[PDB]
Amino acid sequence: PPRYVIGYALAPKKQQSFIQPSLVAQAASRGMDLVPVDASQPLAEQGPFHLLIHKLYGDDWRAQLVAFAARHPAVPIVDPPHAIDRLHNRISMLQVVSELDHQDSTFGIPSQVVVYDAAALADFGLLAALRFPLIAKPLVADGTAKSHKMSLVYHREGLGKLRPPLVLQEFVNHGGVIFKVYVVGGHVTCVKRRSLPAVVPPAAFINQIAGGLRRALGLQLFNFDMIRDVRAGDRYLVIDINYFPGYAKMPGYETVLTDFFWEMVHK
Amino acid sequence: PPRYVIGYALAPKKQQSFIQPSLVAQAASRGMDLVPVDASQPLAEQGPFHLLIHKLYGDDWRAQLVAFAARHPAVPIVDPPHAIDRLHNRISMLQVVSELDHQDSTFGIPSQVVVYDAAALADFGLLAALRFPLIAKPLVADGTAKSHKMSLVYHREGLGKLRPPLVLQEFVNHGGVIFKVYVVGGHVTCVKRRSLPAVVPPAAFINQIAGGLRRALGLQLFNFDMIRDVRAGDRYLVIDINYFPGYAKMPGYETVLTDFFWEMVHK
Numbered sequence: 001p002p003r004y005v006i007g008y009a010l011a012p013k014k015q016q017s018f019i020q021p022s023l024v025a026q027a028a029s030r031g032m033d034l035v036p037v038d039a040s041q042p043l044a045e046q047g048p049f050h051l052l053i054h055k056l057y058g059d060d061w062r063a064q065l066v067a068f069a070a071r072h073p074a075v076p077i078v079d080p081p082h083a084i085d086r087l088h089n090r091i092s093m094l095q096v097v098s099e100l101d102h103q104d105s106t107f108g109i110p111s112q113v114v115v116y117d118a119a120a121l122a123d124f125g126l127l128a129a130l131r132f133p134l135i136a137k138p139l140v141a142d143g144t145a146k147s148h149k150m151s152l153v154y155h156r157e158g159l160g161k162l163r164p165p166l167v168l169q170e171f172v173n174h175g176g177v178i179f180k181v182y183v184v185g186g187h188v189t190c191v192k193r194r195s196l197p198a199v200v201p202p203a204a205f206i207n208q209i210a211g212g213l214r215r216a217l218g219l220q221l222f223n224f225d226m227i228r229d230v231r232a233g234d235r236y237l238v239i240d241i242n243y244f245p246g247y248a249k250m251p252g253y254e255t256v257l258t259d260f261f262w263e264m265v266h267k
Numbered sequence: 268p269p270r271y272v273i274g275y276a277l278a279p280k281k282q283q284s285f286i287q288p289s290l291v292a293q294a295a296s297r298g299m300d301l302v303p304v305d306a307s308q309p310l311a312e313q314g315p316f317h318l319l320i321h322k323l324y325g326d327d328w329r330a331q332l333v334a335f336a337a338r339h340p341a342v343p344i345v346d347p348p349h350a351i352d353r354l355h356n357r358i359s360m361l362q363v364v365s366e367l368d369h370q371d372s373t374f375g376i377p378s379q380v381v382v383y384d385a386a387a388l389a390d391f392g393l394l395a396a397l398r399f400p401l402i403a404k405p406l407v408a409d410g411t412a413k414s415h416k417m418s419l420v421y422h423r424e425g426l427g428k429l430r431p432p433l434v435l436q437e438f439v440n441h442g443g444v445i446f447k448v449y450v451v452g453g454h455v456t457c458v459k460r461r462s463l464p465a466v467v468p469p470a471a472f473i474n475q476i477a478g479g480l481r482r483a484l485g486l487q488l489f490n491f492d493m494i495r496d497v498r499a500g501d502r503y504l505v506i507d508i509n510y511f512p513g514y515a516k517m518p519g520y521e522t523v524l525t526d527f528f529w530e531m532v533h534k
């Protein structure tokens with residue numbers, strides 16, 4: 001019958017990991033043509049698309065997506081740059097998680113300390129009452145930098161050498177395990193990574209959170225970090241959310257994505 | 268010669284305090300007609316304006332200002348709603364203050380604790396090492412609510428009864444004085460309010476900060492709260508910023524505003 005064009009605008013490293021022959025071939029076998037977006041030409045002069053997927057940042061790419069969205073309201077963008085932006089301030093991101101509605105399993109948000117300058121990082125009294133280890137992230141980051149990754153701190157001296165502005169979370173109530181939950185539209189997958197280089201949370205609970213994050217963030221492609229609060233044992237916290245992660249690591253990612261692409265071009 | 272129309276879109280209480288006969292008459296004496304915007308009609312069908320000043324919130328008023336700004340790019344809006352929004356998240360607001368560049372007087376940003384839910388407000392260990400009193404604000408607020416005001420907390424029991432999500436700042440290093448600095452474009456005024464119901468900071472320093480906030484926030488009308496860190500005695504912190512404050516309280520506000528309106532319609 002008819003064919004659907006899936007335009008992709010990805011950095012070369014993300015093309016190499018995500019746009020694999022096995023994905024291109026599975027999708028073509030179902031009538032879907034994955035077509036790269038030329039970065040050296042405007043998207044406006046670039047050919048019919050039934051779906052645009054991207055992981056590019058900055059005001060020129062944003063402007064192109066803003067114009068594309070005006071010219072072609074019915075063509076889904078995954079994901080809209082105003083929705084990716086909701087992840088860029090750690091404090092406003094966790095604010096979005098705090099808006100979700102709430103069985104046997106409970107859902108929390110971990111308190112944060114924000115330190116804006118070097119003087120505060122030396123002299124703020126409260127920092128001497130922190131339990132270690134800490135999770136530290138820059139307050140604002142898009143993920144593109146290596147220094148935008150959540151990093152562990154083991155003592156006051158290590159904290160003292162970080163670059164403010166930063167957000168600090170205590171990291172002691174979780175029994176040294178982290179659950180990375182991969183989401184693709186209505187579909188969840190879950191990876192029992194072990195932090196500080198086990199029993200998974202209930203699947204129905206994870207699906208409720210995954211779906212609430214999708215509706216609240218307006219993102220189809222993301223992965224959320226979750227911990228068990230092992231004081232109580234049936235309490236869980238979301239500690240991070242990341243746009244369009246390394247799906248290529250999960251075996252069977254090609255089938256999950258192809259199913260998602262097919263769903264999106266029949267919305 | 269020609270006359271200039273200054274449209275104003277204000278709540279009735281703000282009309283009563285700010286749009287006083289003495290302001291209307293001074294401005295008319297200089298060729299400037301202050302004209303109220305009809306809230307029951309679209310702004311698009313509302314008459315030539317050489318300047319629009321407002322203090323209204325919400326998506327309908329925003330949409331009207333977005334359309335006005337497209338149709339009439341050369342007519343200044345004071346202030347643009349995307350710029351007022353920069354004040355609505357306390358953490359991203361202080362992030363904007365942290366971006367300013369930096370003599371005898373130094374300039375800091377106070378560390379904050381963010382508490383997202385009721386469980387954290389009871390159980391977060393770090394809160395038992397806070398010094399009191401604290402400044403507490405909701406993480407997100409526009410100022411229109413009575414509960415959106417920065418409030419003082421004197422002990423753990425009082426902290427325990429607040430409504431998260433909230434931002435906590437220790438409030439002990441300032442020797443019980445707060446400086447409210449009123450800004451109108453390039454012009455500063457300064458009020459030695461005494462907190463917890465004196466020597467002012469140097470005027471050149473205040474003007475540098477006022478001007479950096481104006482460029483960074485893109486606001487003409489605001490007031491910033493500043494404290495002296497009395498450990499060192501030549502260090503100052505910005506602890507709050509508010510859109511379009513009670514200028515009518517300062518004597519001589521009519522002359523300051525009329526001069527600002529005249530400057531804006533000759534940009």
Ligand SMILES: [Cl-]
Pocket residue numbers: 014017018245246247248249
């Ligand atoms: Cl990938």
Ligand SMILES: [Cl-]
Pocket residue numbers: 281284285512513514515516
């Ligand atoms: Cl007023």
